[PDB]
């Protein structure tokens, strides 16, 4: 369950952090780390600008860690010996799941080392905690004299770039108080910019260290007692020249420096004895809550239950996917990818009676992800915004480990899409807000007092923590947690959403995975969620330009830079919805089918010339970030082609499912009529042409006058309608997508194509001021992984995804050493303009590497077709966990973005992970966890009746010698088989002979044969079954 | 009229700075050094953003010196010493007018080791010479082999803010060329900011070593090659484990990295001897130019010669105040605080036959002034802008030292008072514009193709070293200064003058000492 590293000073760098989770009532914090020196870079509180550590990237922390990291100092009789300070002597790492410990064996001064970190959980005050140990492995008693702490300490107030630029004269604002007290503070003495809440600088950094005994002991916070003239924090002349006992009665610099805090003691160590020190560093917002904190006596116990709670706290979030197999190295790197995903998406939690909340979330960011600024919140409930795309992915399987949540994902994914088919890119935190005369009927049993303040408080938006926060500190300690459920339950949800930056042509793709996998839990409640009118429409911002109007010409020749009219900006603060009666009424629900059809006609006529691909007029590339100048080339993809051909798909067998009356609003059923006009009327001409060029002006024409109309308001009217004929709509537009699909495999290869980019060689200017094209000219790109990733979704034969799977395996896109898929061919032979990537060297980054994300895509689609031999064969050989550590470079338990090929110029970095870990490939792994454990569709219906059954698909290689097998099913619910023989047991070569359940009651029962029905396939789905018993081919031989 | 400092490791820390000055026909550039270690922190040319060695605040630059600063490493029969990095050893420091030497005598080892720094000048290239020496002691021959070099250079391109936030991430850009020639060549692969000009980056940073005899040597770019998995930089661990030989023969890394610049040479010192290595770091702007520069051979009396010539140019800048008393610090205290307000407020000169133009003259910044921005001009006649109040105090008494000046600074700073009292903060630079007849007449004795290149730049608004270095590439290495005097007294000066920020209500009150002093 831990990974351990020896002689981490030796081997390649590494850049890694912990989870900084202070449970549901803790502050977390954030701290990351490197396997160099004391192995501590950066620490701190919130966002930038509030570390109590100086935050560096990669490269500079790892050349400053052995100076501005943790310094611990020792003296045995005269001469000064530093821990680890030289790789020479033995030392060893041990990476927890929430926790990291390190120590050396020093054999020749006769002393050991050992070194725990980890985040105080559960408390009111963040903090750090840091144990030192030291024994003595000597034969004689010794006289040591220890010292021990930070030699950087960044005063609360000073900003990362003042400290960055201008420290020299930041120095003026520093000091340090509190010494006679044993508790320093750090913080500036006024507020460095020039504006209003002077003198308000009341938060600050403190340090508090104690034996076992629980005294505390006298700072120092110059370092000029320890270093004297050495300002390279190199030796400790200080200390050597002069005893400990004498530094402690010197006069200290307590301003115009830049503060430390040094902890010593003495004593006399006897053979086998040992000496422990405990530590806190943290940052408060007020002295009022530190001295508070500080006002019962802390020692040894508290700290060891600390640390024990802050273990069983990740060993029980972790708990929902615990498995046994053949190795243990699996089952790790399962509970990793869990924590991983749970990190980056949010845990989801039944908050109150009908809320459901997210919590743990954040903006992620590290020392190899230097470009991003992350953020916390320090409080109760700690949650935080993100992307749409990431968090879209990361709640994919939601459902599956948290029955309760229903229908929440989808209805919140599908309530940001606008009317023009584009989305906004920020997810903000959720909040809530409380009405007058709810929260005046509310507050009956308090003082008025403290009535007037918590109704004040309530009515204004607020997020949990805060109103616990407010809740503390208006009742003092002696509060009760019915008045906070009650006001919970009864605050009402606010909506959420921010613009971002643009618009991609991407993220509306990752929704039929999530209706799929909703699907496949509640088989019966499909007609339900289709004829559900709750869903909303966010209110579109920026309008996209014409396209006459988006074409600008260069000396280059022509192009399409500009993309949106800055003369229709909206304002992002009035409203997040969209209200009938041209923005005057009330607000506008739409039902899931009418979103679908939406989605599915805006994604049409969207085409482009040759009708092959689509454009990406947003102004940003595809799921590919790196290639940011292809939209300026008139680019289109072909993987957004098999996602509408796979939804258009869907929608024609709903609708031929279920039949009755469906409802759209006039400027939809308009537009409807217009695009089945315009199919039925070019249909021939389709078929027989090459380049197409009134199918696209006609359509174009279409999609302008719909989304113009429909960007100023819509009116409340709505036109009915029936199946049939959207059917047959559906129907053509799927033929259309068919017949153009088709044309591209033709023109492109032996492989599917992922991009396009056309150049048009004649333009006509016209009278208005816009430009009309006359011709494209298409041109050629390097294959794409992607390609026929997205191609492997769509319902074909198995033998052409057979013959697929071949041509891929042959091509270039397989790396011959590593066996492992890249990302694309050569881009070395293609336009300079294409964007970042074409600035990389070939083996590093987004160009020609090992993505992880990508080939954990392909697998997943492998498994899915059916190829279970391939599948197997291939993820023996490219799974982390399976991988060699010592050419990893990392842990085998944590993922990384991308692996360095066998393009990289440099031979002895091909194969190492890079960026950490966080990728996207955690909730691919989960979805491939899943579908081979317990089989694509565990619960069918047929007449109105639940089915359960098991098609489990386990390679040879992870069946233990005793044929034993368990599995976490619905995170409560555990499975154990029972595998008679060493051999693949794919679907169709074994059969179930029976199962037993379970109850939690203590009864029990046994069902012959494989399938359950009824009751019990009931009780299976609402949590009542403890664990079950599963038989295949009977007992297990030899 | 040296300054002598002995053990300056265990002394109080202070900041200074090279004066920065290449003379008339000279690219000047900026160094800071502190009292630590081999004493340079960071230099290089024009503003920041453009630096060889980056940018350290004082604090930074105190902790960081011993590291990122020049090493120099030798090896005496298996046991790797280090130079200038163990203050218990002797060691001592000069301050020169225009110049910084080091030495230190270490008698364990019983070999002596001497550095100096100091700014080529009169030359079309700015870069920093350095010349390092290394005397045996001993009494019997000994194997030395040495290694010196400087263990970061920023490729050219890459901005200070683009470091100190997303270094990590700034690697990608990064690559060296050329080390075949034995002149590596550092710049990005293309632009960092996502606008035009792509692949358009030409300039870079270059590095050249020679002995006496004049031949170049092959540099170290990839610095695992020294210190392994040691990545603090503080154990030469590469260098301990092979010979010098087996590392110049091992294949260095070009792309990904953070390059620097290391070389290396093997003798065999007799008792007396003494070994010199010469480098010049520097930056220019295309690669032709690099190559026309080296186009003939440098050797050592090429070196003394340039320093002879450096000190002579501060020497004879700073000989208009020269004095005689009881205590020789005066008048060198004298000499020094001459230096500085020609250095801060821009020294006269005669130009052409009827204008008056100032030179050196630069936006200050320093190592404990990191709030500023400085910029420097990097082209001949040196100049550069500055603030109402200390231009306007810095030339109180220049018309005592130069007499020609006449009333040029009483009417120039006083049309620079508006209306209403108030004065802009901002003193540009001067520029001179020429009109159309007078610049078809003046351009009568030169080919129409040159004209008419000369006539559309000369027309537009320009600055002297701009119409030289025009000059000089129109007309290759064979033109006449006489067009050149002659552009220059036709020229039309052109008025000055930047609002900048606001108001102050005592900038009006430094012209009555102007005037008195007339
Ligand atoms: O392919 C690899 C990955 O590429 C990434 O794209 C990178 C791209 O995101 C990056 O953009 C840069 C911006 O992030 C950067 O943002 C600037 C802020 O940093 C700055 O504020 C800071 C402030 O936070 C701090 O406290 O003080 C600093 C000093 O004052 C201050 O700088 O504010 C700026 C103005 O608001 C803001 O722009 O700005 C850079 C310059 O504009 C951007 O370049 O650029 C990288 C290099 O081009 C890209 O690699 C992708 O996002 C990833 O997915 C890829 O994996
Ligand atoms: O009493 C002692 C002395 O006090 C001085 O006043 C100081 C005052 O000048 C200073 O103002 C600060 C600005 O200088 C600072 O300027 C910012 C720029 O630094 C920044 O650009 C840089 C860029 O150059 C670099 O390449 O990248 C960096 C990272 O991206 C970037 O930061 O741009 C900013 C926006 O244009 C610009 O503001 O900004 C600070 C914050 O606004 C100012 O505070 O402040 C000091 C502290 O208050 C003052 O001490 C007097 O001038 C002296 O006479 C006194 O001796």
Redesign the interface.
């Known amino acids: 369950e831990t990974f351990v590293m020896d002689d981490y ?3 390649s ?1 590494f850049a890694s952090f912990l989870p900084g989770i202070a449970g549901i009532r803790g502050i977390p914090i954030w701290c990351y780390y490197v396997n ?1 020196g004391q192995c501590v870079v950066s620490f701190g509180v919130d966002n930038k600008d509030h570390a109590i550590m100086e935050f560096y ?4 922390a ?6 501005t990291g943790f310094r611990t100092f020792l003296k045995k009789n005269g001469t000064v010996f530093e821990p680890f300070s030289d ?1 020479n002597i033995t030392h060893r790492m041990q990476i927890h799941m929430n926790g990291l410990a390190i120590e050396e064996q020093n054999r020749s001064s006769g002393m050991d080392t050992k070194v725990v970190y980890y985040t105080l959980p559960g408390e009111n005050v963040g903090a750090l905690v840091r144990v030192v140990s030291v024994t003595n492995q000597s034969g004689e008693p010794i006289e040591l004299e220890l010292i021990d702490g930070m030699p950087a300490v960044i005063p609360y107030g000073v900003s990362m770039d003042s400290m ?6 930041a ?1 003026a604002w520093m000091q340090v108080e509190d010494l006679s007290e044993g508790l320093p503070y750090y913080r500036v003495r006024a507020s460095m910019d020039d504006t209003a809440a002077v003198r308000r600088i009341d938060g600050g950094n403190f340090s508090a260290c104690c034996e076992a005994d629980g005294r505390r002991l006298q700072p120092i916070v110059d370092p000029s007692l320890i270093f004297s ?6 030796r400790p002349v200080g200390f050597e020249e002069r005893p400990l006992k004498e530094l402690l009665l010197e006069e200290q610099m307590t301003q115009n420096l ?1 503060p430390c805090s040094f902890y010593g003691i003495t004593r006399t160590l006897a053979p086998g004895g040992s000496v422990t020190l405990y530590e806190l560093i943290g940052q408060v917002e007020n002295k009022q809550l530190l001295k508070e904190y500080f006002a019962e006596k802390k020692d040894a116990a508290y700290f060891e239950a600390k640390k024990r709670e802050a273990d069983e706290l990740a060993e029980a979030l972790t708990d929902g996917i615990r498995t046994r197999t053949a190795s243990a190295a699996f089952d790790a790197y399962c509970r990793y990818t869990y924590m991983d995903n749970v990190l980056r998406g949010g845990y989801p939690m039944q908050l109150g009676n009908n809320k459901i909340f997210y919590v743990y979330s954040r903006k992620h960011g590290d ?2 992800r ?2 991003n600024y992350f953020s916390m919140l320090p409080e109760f409930y700690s949650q935080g915004n993100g992307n749409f795309r990431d968090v879209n992915q990361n709640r994919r399987c939601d459902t599956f480990f948290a029955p309760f949540v229903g229908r929440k994902n989808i209805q919140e994914f599908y309530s940001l899409i606008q009317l023009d088919g584009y989305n906004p890119l920020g997810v903000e935190k959720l909040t809530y807000r409380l009405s007058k005369e709810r929260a005046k009927k509310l507050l009956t049993d308090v003082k008025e007092e403290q009535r007037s303040a918590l109704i004040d408080f309530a009515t204004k938006p607020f997020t949990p923590g805060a109103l616990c926060r407010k809740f503390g500190e208006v009742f003092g300690d002696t509060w009760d947690e019915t008045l906070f459920i009650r006001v919970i339950d009864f605050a009402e949800e606010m909506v959420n959403g921010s613009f971002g930056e643009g618009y991609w042509s991407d993220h509306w793709t990752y929704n039929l995975d999530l209706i799929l996998d909703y699907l496949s839990v509640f088989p019966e409640q499909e007609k339900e969620m289709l004829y559900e009118e709750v869903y909303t429409t966010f209110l579109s911002r920026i309008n996209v330009n014409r396209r006459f109007r988006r074409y600008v010409e260069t000396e280059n020749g022509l192009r399409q830079y500009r993309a949106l009219n800055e003369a229709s900006r909206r304002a992002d603060l009035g409203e997040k919805l969209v209200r009938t009666e041209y923005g005057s009424g009330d607000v506008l629900t739409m039902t899931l089918m009418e979103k679908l059809i939406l989605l599915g006609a805006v994604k049409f006529a969207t085409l482009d010339a040759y009708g092959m691909g689509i454009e990406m007029e947003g102004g940003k590339p595809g799921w590919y970030d790196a290639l ?1 100048g292809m939209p300026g080339l008139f680019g289109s993809s072909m993987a957004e082609t098999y996602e509408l051909a796979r939804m258009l798909s869907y929608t024609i067998e709903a609708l031929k499912q279920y039949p009755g009356e469906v409802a759209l609003i006039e400027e939809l059923g308009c537009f409807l009529d217009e695009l089945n006009l315009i199919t039925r009327l070019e249909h021939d001409n389709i078929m027989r042409d090459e380049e197409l060029l009134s199918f696209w002006n006609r359509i174009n024409d279409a999609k302008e006058i719909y989304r113009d109309k429909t960007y100023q308001g819509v009116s409340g009217k709505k036109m009915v309608y029936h199946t049939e004929q959207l059917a047959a709509i559906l129907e053509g537009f799927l033929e259309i997508v068919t017949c153009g699909i088709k044309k591209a495999r033709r023109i492109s290869g032996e492989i599917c194509p992922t991009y396009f980019t056309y150049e048009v060689p004649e333009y006509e200017k016209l009278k208005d001021g816009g430009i009309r094209p006359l011709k494209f000219v298409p041109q050629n790109m390097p294959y794409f992984l992607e390609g026929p990733v997205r191609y492997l979704k769509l319902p074909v034969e198995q033998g052409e995804k057979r013959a697929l799977y071949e041509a891929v395996k042959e091509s270039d896109l397989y790396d011959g050493e590593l066996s492992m898929y890249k990302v694309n061919a050569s881009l070395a032979d293609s336009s ?2 294409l964007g ?1 990537a ?4 070939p083996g ?2 987004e160009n020609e590497s090992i993505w992880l994300h990508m080939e954990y895509k392909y697998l997943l689609e492998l498994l899915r077709s059916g190829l279970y031999e391939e599948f197997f064969a291939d993820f023996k050989k490219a799974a982390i966990p399976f991988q060699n550590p010592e050419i990893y470079g990392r842990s085998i338990y944590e993922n990384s973005s991308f692996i360095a090929s066998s393009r990289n ?2 031979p002895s970095c091909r194969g190492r992970g890079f960026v950490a870990r966080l990728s996207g490939s955690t909730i691919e792994f989960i979805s491939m966890w899943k579908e081979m454990m317990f089989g694509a569709h565990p619960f069918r219906t047929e007449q109105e009746e639940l089915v359960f059954s098991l098609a489990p698909a386990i390679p040879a290689y992870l069946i233990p010698e005793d044929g034993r097998l368990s599995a976490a099913f619905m995170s409560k619910t555990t499975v154990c088989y029972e595998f008679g023989g060493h051999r693949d047991y794919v679907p169709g070569t074994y059969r179930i002979r029976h199962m037993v359940f379970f109850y939690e009651n203590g009864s029990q029962a046994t069902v012959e044969g494989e399938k359950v029905s009824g009751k019990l396939a009931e009780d299976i789905r609402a949590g009542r079954v403890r664990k079950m018993e599963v038989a295949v081919d009977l007992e297990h031989h030899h």
């Open positions: 000073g030796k081997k760098t160099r990237p990669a490269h500079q790892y050349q400053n860690v052995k100076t790789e960055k630029n201008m420290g020299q004269t120095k003239y050495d300002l390279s924090l190199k830049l020392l190899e230097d470009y940011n300079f303009e970042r074409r600035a990389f060297t590093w980054l110029p440099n």
